[PDB]
RNA sequence: UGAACAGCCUCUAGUUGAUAGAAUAAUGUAGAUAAGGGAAGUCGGCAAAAUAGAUCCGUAACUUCGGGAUAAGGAUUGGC
RNA sequence: UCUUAAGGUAGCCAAAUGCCUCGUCAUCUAAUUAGUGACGCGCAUGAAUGGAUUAACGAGAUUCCCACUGUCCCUAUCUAC
RNA sequence: CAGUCAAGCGUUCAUAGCGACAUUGCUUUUUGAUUCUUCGAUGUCGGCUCUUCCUAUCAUACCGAAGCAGAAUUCGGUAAGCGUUGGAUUGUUCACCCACUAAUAGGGAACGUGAGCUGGGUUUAGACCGUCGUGAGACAGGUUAGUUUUACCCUACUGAUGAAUGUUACCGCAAUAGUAAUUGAACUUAGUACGAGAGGAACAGUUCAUUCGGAUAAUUGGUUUUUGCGGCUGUCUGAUCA
C-alpha cells in the first residue's frame, strides 16, 4: 500500500480513508477528512490554521 | 454504454439523471450537453435513468452552434463531480460534469479534450483516451 | 380494473412474520450433512460480534481488471474464546421426526454455565446438578448404561457446549449453552470423543481454518415499532396528502372484503433471526499472541484491537475470526458460526487470501494513527509528557 | 509488414501497445491473436512485456518510450515499476514523471534522435526527457493539434502526420525533425494516426480496417521493405 | 440598536395564570437540514428556496413624455 | 341576375366568440391537443349590443427563459408538542 | 376472440404462411336492450399509491414447423415462475410522438381503490362571449372563480402480552403455513460453422452489469440539543473575567 499526505494539513492518509478531489486545472488534492476538505472549500490558508504541519513549519513550533 | 464498450465497467455511483446539463469538453463548438437518455439503463417505475462516468448517453446541444442544436446525438461522460468509490477505496470527484460528443460506435466528433478525464472512461473508450490530455 | 403500471412487489414474503425472535441466540435449523469417513469434528461454533474494520489485500482474479492489484475490504471481527464441552445428547429418528432420548452431562459444571439455569442467582442455594454429580463418583453404574444406550440407538449425536463469557469484556457473567452436531466417524466414535472431551475446551482453529466459506446465524439489531415506509420500503405519498404521507394508500380492493396478508403494514422492525451464507474467513487469530494485527508485509507488532478499543465492546484478548463483509446482529451479540452446507467452487470460494495491512485506527472518530508509538512520533512531545 | 491486429475488437493498436526498437509493451488483457502478432513478428530477440500502467489497460497513451529510456506517469504503482525494471533490459532507464498532463504517450511524440512535445509542458519535464531519453526536444503543434503523440506516428526512417495538416507545417516539421513526413490516414480514415498504429525500424502494427493504400503509405514512409 | 410608536433586549409597573408526573414507538401538527442532479414531480413551480438594508456605477423595448425604473446588471459594507 | 327593409362597411380572428378541429403554414422542444406569429366562404366576428389600438396599473387567466430549491430521482435525520 | 369447409393467392403447389362465398361457437375488458335491487342517498371522471388474480404470452426457459443455408423473421405447443419503463402535449381514459430496453402484452377485483390522497374535469349558486328567444332564460358550445366532514366500536390485517396443562428452569423436535431471485452486456469460441458473395451464429469458459430481496455501518456522504469547541450581532449583568 501507499500512505499519502494531506494536501491541506499534511496528515498521513491510510488506504480507504478520506477523499480525493481533482480540480479543473488538473491538480489532485487529497483530504484526510471532511474537516480539512471543508476548510479547503472555504478557501482558508493553511499557513494561518494553527494545527497544520505547514503552520508549525512556518512558526518553528516543534522543529 | 452498450455496443462500443471495450470491456466491462464496475458500478460507479450514478450522478447525472435525465435532464442534467453538463459542460461539453471537446472542441466541436458545442457548449453544453443536455442528457435525455442513458444507454443500457434499466426499467423501474418513477425512477429516472441516471448516468455515471464512462457511460454513453443521448444528448442534445442546448447552447452552442446552430448545426449542432435541435438534434439528438450520442455523448460520453468524462467528468462526474459526484463522488464515487474505486476498488482501491479512494472516494474521488471532479468539480464539474463534462462529456464529449460521439457517434454510436464511440469515436469522437471532436479532436481534443480540455481538462481531465477519468480512467474508468479512458479504459472503456479508446478514442477518448486518444484525444484526452490528462487521464486521472 | 388492472394496475396501470407494473412494478415489483415491495418486500420478501418468505421472511414472514416480521416478529421478534423467540430468543437472543438464533437457532441452527440445519447442520452440514454427515459422512462417516472424516474424523470427529464439530459443525459450528459460538462467538460474540465485536465490530468491523478494513483490510488491504492483493486481489487474485485471473481475468478481472483489478487482477494482481490492491483492494480495501470491510471485515467484521467475532471474538471467540475456547468453548467448553459439557454434555452430549443423542437423537433417534421416528416417523414423527428426530427425538432426543437421553442427555449425559459432564461432572464438574462451572458457575458461568450453571448460571444459565437460574433467573435469581444471587438468592439461591446453588443446588443444580448436585444429585447428578452424586450419580457420578461411583465406578460407572448410572453412566455408561446411558452412554451405551446412545451407542445402541441415537442415529444423531449432538454435543452440549457453552461459551466462556468471563473471558470477554461483556458484563453478563452467564454463559450461552448450545447443541453442536458432530460430523465424523461412527456413533460410538462420536460419543467416545464427547466422553473424552467432557470438562475440556475446544479452540476455534480446531473447527475453522483460513479461506473457508462459512455461515453466520444471529438475531438482527432491533428497531421497535416502525412505519410501513421504512419497514417495507414503500413509496412516500406526495406532500399535499391529508392525514399523513408515510403510509400505503390502498390497502386492498373492495373484494375480497378483508385486508390481505400480503399488504405491507406497520409493526416490529428488526430483532429477527437470520442466516447469512457464504462469508469467507480471512484470519483465524490467536489470542495468546502479540502482532495479531500484523501481516507479513506490515510487520509491526500490534494487536487486532483498535486505538481506544472497539467502540461499545472493548478488547480482543481471546482468539477471533476475521470474516469478510457484514454479518447479521450488532456488537456484543452471541452469533453462531456454521460450516457450509455445500461445497462451493465458484472461482471465488477457492481464492487463497493473504492480507497486506489491517486497520487499527480509532473507530470513535476520524483516527489518524494506527499505534500510539506512531501518534507520538508524528506529534512530537506534548505538555502532559515531560 | 504493417500487421493487421485488433485488441479484442479495437483497431487502435497504439493505444494498447508501445513499440520501440529495443522492447515492446502490451496490455495484460489481450487476446491470443494480439499477443501472437508481436510474438511472431518481433521474435525472441526483442522482449515483450505484458504491463499495466496506473491500473489502466491503455499503456501507449500513458507512456512515452525510447531505446535508451522509458517514461511513466506518477500514478504508476511500485509493483508495476518493479515488474518493468525486472522485465526490461539493463540498458533502458525507467523514471517516473511528476507532471500535470500525465499522459505521456499523448503528450510526447518521440524517436531515437529528436522529439516533439506538447507546448505547455513544464521545464523540469523537458529537461527530464532530454536527460533520460537523451533526445533533443521541440515544443510544436501539428497544424494546431497539441496532442502530437496521438496525431503523429514517428520513427527513424520517416513519419506519418495528421491528414488535415498545412503543407507549410509539413516542410517546417520535416526540416525540424530531419525526416520525411507524409499526411495520411489509418484504420479506414481515422485521424488519430499515433493512436492508430505503432512502428519501429522494421515493424509496423496497425488495425485490421486499415486499407491497402493506407498500408502502402505506411510501408513507403517507414521504409519497412 | 435602528430611518422608525418595525423586530430584538432592558428600566418603572404588573404577572409567573393555561391539569400534572414518567418515558421518547409508529402515524401526525409545527419548525428545520440535506451529497449529485435541478421541475425530470404536478392540471399547474402548489409548497419551499433564492433576492432583500444602505452607498457608488449602470439601466432596454415601449410610451398618453408624466413613466417604465429598485428595470435588467455589477461593486462595497467590521474593528481600530 | 333574383330577392329584401337593407344586405356585414372600416376593422378583427380557430380570439374568453370556429362545430368540423388536435384547422393549415412557420416558430418554440429530443418529442408540444399547450404558447406565439400568420391565413380566412367567419357552424355562429364586427362597429356606444360599441369596433380596433393602447402606456401605466392587477392577491385576474395563460406560455416561455434565467436564478433557485427534497416538487421529484429517493429518501434520511433532528427539535418541540 | 376462436373454429369447420376450401374457390383461390403463394413461380410451380388448397392448407409454409394466408384464405373468398358460407357456417358453428366462446367472452363480458365495447356499446346496446331490459328495469330485478337501491331515490328516510351504496360518495359516478381521471391520476397517484398498493396488493392479488386471469391468460386470449410482449420478453425470459425448453421445444415442434417453415417458401428454416447463416443472420434476421414467421406460425405453433407446455407455460402466468418472473418482468413489462423515462418523457413533451392534453383534466382526460384513449391517442400521438421522443427515447431507453429482453420487452415496453391484454385484462379483472362494486367500470378495485375519495372516513387513502388530489380536485385538473364534470356537476350548484358569481361572471364573459357566440348562437337561439320578445322576454325571463336555454345551450355533453367555449371561458374563468368556486368549504372534499367523523373511526376511540366489531371484524379483518400488522405487530405485542397472556390464565389453565404439579411448580420452575434449560436444551430441543417439526405438524402446518409462507418462500425468491431476475435479466442483460463484453471477451473468447470466431470472422469459425453456413454461404456464390454480401454477410455471419451457437454450446462450454471468464469478467461485469440491470431489476429485486436480506442485512450491516470499517470507509465516504447526509443529519446535530453532544447546545462539544470556536467565532459573530443586538441588549443586560458598572468594566474585566464569566
Ligand atoms: Mg410516475
Ligand atoms: Mg386501477
Ligand atoms: Mg397489467
Ligand atoms: Mg465510528
Query: What are the CA-CA distances from residue D212 to residues C340, D209, D224 (Å)?
Result: 61, 9, 15
| C365 → chain A, closest CA residue | A33
Q: How far apart (Å, rounded) are the C-alpha atoms in residues C357 and C379? A: 23
Q: Do the Cβ atoms of D162 and D141 come closer than 8 Å?
A: no
List B residues 90-129 in contact with D (Cβ-Cβ < 8 A).
Answer: 107, 111-112, 119, 122-123, 126-127, 129
Instruction: Please tell me the CATH code under which domain D1-225 is placed.
Output: 3.75.10.10
Q: Which residue is nearest to nucleotide F76 (CA to C1')?
A: C230
Angle made by CA atoms C252, C254, C255, in degrees to the nearest 5: 95
Q: How far apart (Å, rounded) are the C-alpha atoms in residues C15 and C228? A: 16
Q: Where on strand F do bases come within 7 A of a protein Cβ?
A: 28-31, 70-77
Name the residue among B88, B111, B132 with its Cβ closest to that of D106.
Answer: B132
**Nearest CA among B102, B103, B95 for reference residue B136:** B95
- The grid cell for B134 is 490528462
| A26 → chain B, closest CA residue | B116
- Tell if the CB–CB gap between D28 and C69 is shorter than 8 Å: no
Q: Where are the domains of chain D?
A: 1-225
Q: Which chains touch D (3 or more CB pairs under 8 A)?
A: A, B, C
- The grid cell for D75 is 500514478
List the single best residue of D52, D56, D58 to mutate versus C (max C Cβ within 10 A): D52
Q: How far is the CA of A49 from the C1' of E43 (A)?
A: 55
B11 at C interface, C-beta within 8 A: no
B47: closest CA of chain D, how far (Å): 33
Method: cryo-EM
Residues lying with their CB under 5 A of ligand 2, a single-atom ion? C 1
C111 at A interface, C-beta within 8 A: no
Q: How far apart are the first and last CA of chain B?
A: 20
How many C-beta neighbours within 10 Å does residue C65 have?
19
Taking the CA atoms of residue C272, residue C276, residue C281 and residue C283 in that order, the dihedral angle to the nearest 10 degrees is -10
Number of H helices, E strands in chain B: 2, 9
How many C-beta neighbours within 10 Å does residue C315 have?
15
Taking the CA atoms of residue C321, residue C325, residue C328 and residue C333 in that order, the dihedral angle to the nearest 10 degrees is 40
Q: How far apart (Å, rounded) are the C-alpha atoms in residues B7 and C226? A: 44
Q: Which residue is nearest to nucleotide G178 (CA to C1')?
A: C14
- Residue A3 φ/ψ, nearest 5 degrees: -105, 115
Domains contained in chain C, CATH given: 16-81+203-220+270-384 (2.40.30.10), 82-202 (3.30.1430.10)
The per-residue b/e assignment along C66-84, b for 16 or more CB within 10 angstroms, e otherwise, is: beebbbbbebbbbbbbbbb
CB contacts of D192 in chain B (<8 Å) are 127, 130-131
Taking the CA atoms of residue C145, residue C149, residue C150 and residue C151 in that order, the dihedral angle to the nearest 10 degrees is 100
- The grid cell for B106 is 464511440
Q: Do the Cβ atoms of C364 and C308 come closer than 8 Å?
A: yes
Q: Where are the domains of chain B?
A: 15-136
**Nearest CA among C25, C274, C273 for reference residue C163:** C25
Q: Do the Cβ atoms of D117 and D108 come closer than 8 Å?
A: yes
Q: Do the Cβ atoms of B136 and B117 come closer than 8 Å?
A: yes
Displacement of CA C30 from its chain's centroid (Å): 15
Q: How far apart (Å, rounded) are the C-alpha atoms in residues C204 and C222? A: 28
Q: Do the Cβ atoms of A24 and A30 come closer than 8 Å?
A: no
Q: How far apart (Å, rounded) are the C-alpha atoms in residues B80 and C367? A: 29
Residue C317 is given by DSSP the state: -
- Tell if the CB–CB gap between B89 and C72 is shorter than 8 Å: yes
CATH architecture of B15-136: Beta Barrel (2.40)
**Nearest CA among C23, C66, C25, C20 for reference residue C49:** C25
Indicate which ligand has the atom closest to the C-alpha of B48.
1
Q: How far apart (Å, rounded) are the C-alpha atoms in residues A46 and D137? A: 38
Q: Do the Cβ atoms of C204 and C284 come closer than 8 Å?
A: yes
Q: Look at strands B116-117 and B21-24 and give their pairing.
A: unpaired
Q: What is the CA radius of gyration of chain A?
A: 12
Q: Do the Cβ atoms of B118 and B54 come closer than 8 Å?
A: yes
- Residue D46 φ/ψ, nearest 5 degrees: -115, 125
C319: closest CA of chain A, how far (Å): 26
- The grid cell for B116 is 481531465
Q: How far is the CA of C258 from the C1' of G157 (A)?
A: 8
Q: Return the residue matching grid coordinates 451405551.
A: C148
Q: How far apart (Å, rounded) are the C-alpha atoms in residues C135 and C143? A: 8
Q: How far apart (Å, rounded) are the C-alpha atoms in residues C229 and C235? A: 7
- The grid cell for D31 is 487476446
Q: Return the residue matching grid coordinates 493505444.
A: D15
Tell me the structure's resolution in angstroms, rounded to a single decimal. Answer: 2.6
* Last residue before each gap in chain A (C to N over 2.5 A): none
Burial of D140 (0-12, 13-18, 19+ CB in 10 A): middle
Amino acid at each position: 500500500m501507499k500512505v499519502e499526505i494531506d494536501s491541506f494539513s499534511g496528515a498521513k492518509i491510510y488506504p480507504g480513508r478520506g477523499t480525493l478531489f481533482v480540480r479543473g486545472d488538473s491538480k489532485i488534492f487529497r483530504f484526510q477528512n471532511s474537516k480539512s476538505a471543508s476548510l479547503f472549500k472555504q478557501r482558508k490558508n493553511p499557513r494561518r490554521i494553527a494545527w497544520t504541519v505547514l503552520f508549525r513549519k512556518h512558526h518553528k513550533k516543534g522543529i | 454504454s452498450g455496443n462500443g464498450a471495450q470491456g466491462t465497467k464496475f458500478r460507479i455511483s450514478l450522478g447525472l439523471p435525465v435532464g442534467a446539463i453538463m459542460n461539453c469538453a471537446d472542441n466541436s463548438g458545442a457548449r453544453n450537453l443536455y442528457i435525455i437518455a442513458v444507454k443500457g439503463s434499466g426499467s423501474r417505475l418513477n425512477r429516472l435513468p441516471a448516468a455515471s462516468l464512462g457511460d454513453m448517453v443521448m444528448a442534445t446541444v442546448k447552447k452552442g452552434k446552430p448545426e449542432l442544436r435541435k438534434k439528438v446525438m450520442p455523448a460520453i461522460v468524462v467528468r462526474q463531480a459526484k463522488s464515487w468509490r474505486r476498488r482501491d477505496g479512494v472516494f474521488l470527484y471532479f468539480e464539474d460534469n463534462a462529456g464529449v460528443i460521439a457517434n454510436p460506435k464511440g469515436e469522437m466528433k471532436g479532436s481534443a479534450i480540455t481538462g481531465p478525464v477519468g480512467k474508468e472512461c479512458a479504459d472503456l473508450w479508446p478514442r477518448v483516451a486518444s484525444n484526452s490530455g490528462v487521464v486521472v | 380494473s388492472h394496475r396501470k403500471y407494473e412494478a415489483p412487489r415491495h418486500g420478501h414474503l418468505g421472511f414472514l412474520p416480521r416478529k421478534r425472535a423467540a430468543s437472543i441466540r438464533a437457532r441452527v435449523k440445519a447442520f452440514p450433512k454427515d459422512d462417516r469417513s472424516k474424523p470427529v469434528a464439530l459443525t459450528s461454533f459460538l462467538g460474540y460480534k465485536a465490530g468491523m474494520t478494513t483490510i488491504v489485500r492483493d486481489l487474485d482474479r485471473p481475468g478481472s481488471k483489478f487482477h494482481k492489484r490492491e483492494v480495501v475490504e470491510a471485515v467484521t471481527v467475532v471474538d471467540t474464546p475456547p468453548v467448553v464441552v459439557v454434555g452430549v445428547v443423542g437423537y433417534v429418528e421416528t416417523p414423527r421426526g428426530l427425538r432426543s432420548l437421553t442427555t449425559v452431562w459432564a461432572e464438574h459444571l462451572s458457575d458461568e454455565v450453571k448460571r444459565r439455569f437460574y433467573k435469581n442467582w444471587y438468592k439461591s442455594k446453588k443446588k443444580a446438578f448436585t444429585k447428578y454429580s452424586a450419580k457420578y463418583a461411583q465406578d460407572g453404574a448410572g453412566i455408561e448404561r446411558e452412554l451405551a444406550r446412545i451407542k445402541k440407538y441415537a442415529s444423531v449425536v449432538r454435543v452440549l457446549v457453552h461459551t466462556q463469557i468471563r473471558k470477554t469484556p461483556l458484563a453478563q457473567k452467564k454463559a450461552h449453552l448450545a447443541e453442536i452436531q458432530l460430523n465424523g466417524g461412527s456413533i460410538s466414535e462420536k460419543v467416545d470423543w464427547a466422553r473424552e472431551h467432557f470438562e475440556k475446551t475446544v479452540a476455534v482453529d480446531s473447527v475453522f481454518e483460513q479461506n473457508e466459506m462459512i455461515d453466520a446465524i444471529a438475531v438482527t439489531k432491533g428497531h421497535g415499532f416502525e412505519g410501513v415506509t421504512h419497514r417495507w420500503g414503500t413509496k412516500k405519498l406526495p406532500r399535499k396528502t391529508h392525514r399523513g404521507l408515510r403510509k400505503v394508500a390502498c390497502i386492498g380492493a373492495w373484494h375480497p372484503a378483508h385486508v390481505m396478508w400480503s399488504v405491507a403494514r406497520a409493526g416490529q422492525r428488526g430483532y429477527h433471526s437470520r442466516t447469512s451464507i457464504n462469508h469467507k474467513i480471512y484470519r483465524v487469530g490467536k489470542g495468546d499472541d502479540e502482532a495479531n494485527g500484523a501481516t507479513s508485509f506490515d510487520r509491526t507488532k500490534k494487536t487486532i484491537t483498535p486505538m481506544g478499543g472497539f467502540v461499545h465492546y472493548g478488547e480482543i484478548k481471546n482468539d477471533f475470526i476475521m470474516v469478510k463483509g457484514c454479518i447479521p446482529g450488532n456488537r456484543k451479540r452471541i452469533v453462531t458460526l456454521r460450516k457450509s452446507l455445500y461445497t462451493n467452487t465458484s472461482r471465488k470460494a477457492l481464492e487463497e487470501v493473504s492480507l497486506k495491512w489491517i486497520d487499527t485506527a480509532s473507530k470513535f472518530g476520524k483516527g489518524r494513527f494506527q499505534t500510539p508509538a506512531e501518534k507520538h512520533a508524528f506529534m512530537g512531545t506534548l505538555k502532559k509528557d515531560l | 509488414m504493417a500487421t493487421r491486429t485488433q485488441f479484442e475488437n479495437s483497431n487502435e493498436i497504439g493505444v494498447f501497445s508501445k513499440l520501440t526498437n529495443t522492447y515492446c509493451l502490451v496490455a495484460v488483457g489481450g487476446s491470443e491473436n494480439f499477443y501472437s502478432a508481436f510474438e511472431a513478428e518481433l521474435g525472441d530477440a526483442i522482449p515483450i512485456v505484458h504491463t499495466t500502467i496506473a491500473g489502466t489497460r491503455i499503456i501507449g497513451r500513458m507512456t512515452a518510450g525510447n531505446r535508451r529510456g522509458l517514461l511513466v506517469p506518477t500514478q504508476t504503482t511500485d509493483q508495476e515499476l518493479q515488474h518493468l525494471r525486472n522485465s526490461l533490459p539493463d540498458s533502458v532507464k525507467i523514471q517516473r514523471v511528476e507532471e500535470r498532463l500525465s499522459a505521456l504517450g499523448n503528450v510526447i511524440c518521440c524517436n531515437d534522435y529528436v522529439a516533439l512535445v506538447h507546448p505547455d509542458i513544464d521545464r523540469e519535464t523537458e529537461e527530464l526527457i532530454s536527460d533520460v531519453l537523451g533526445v533533443e526536444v521541440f515544443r510544436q503543434t501539428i497544424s494546431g493539434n497539441i496532442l502530437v503523440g496521438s496525431y503523429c506516428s514517428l520513427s527513424n526512417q520517416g513519419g506519418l502526420v495528421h491528414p488535415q495538416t498545412s503543407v507549410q507545417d509539413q516542410e517546417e516539421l520535416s526540416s525540424l525533425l530531419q525526416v520525411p513526413l507524409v499526411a495520411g490516414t489509418v484504420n479506414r480514415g481515422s485521424s488519430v494516426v499515433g493512436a492508430g498504429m505503432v512502428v519501429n525500424d522494421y515493424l509496423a502494427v496497425t488495425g485490421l480496417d486499415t486499407t491497402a493504400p493506407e498500408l502502402s503509405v505506411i510501408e513507403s514512409i517507414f521504409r519497412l521493405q
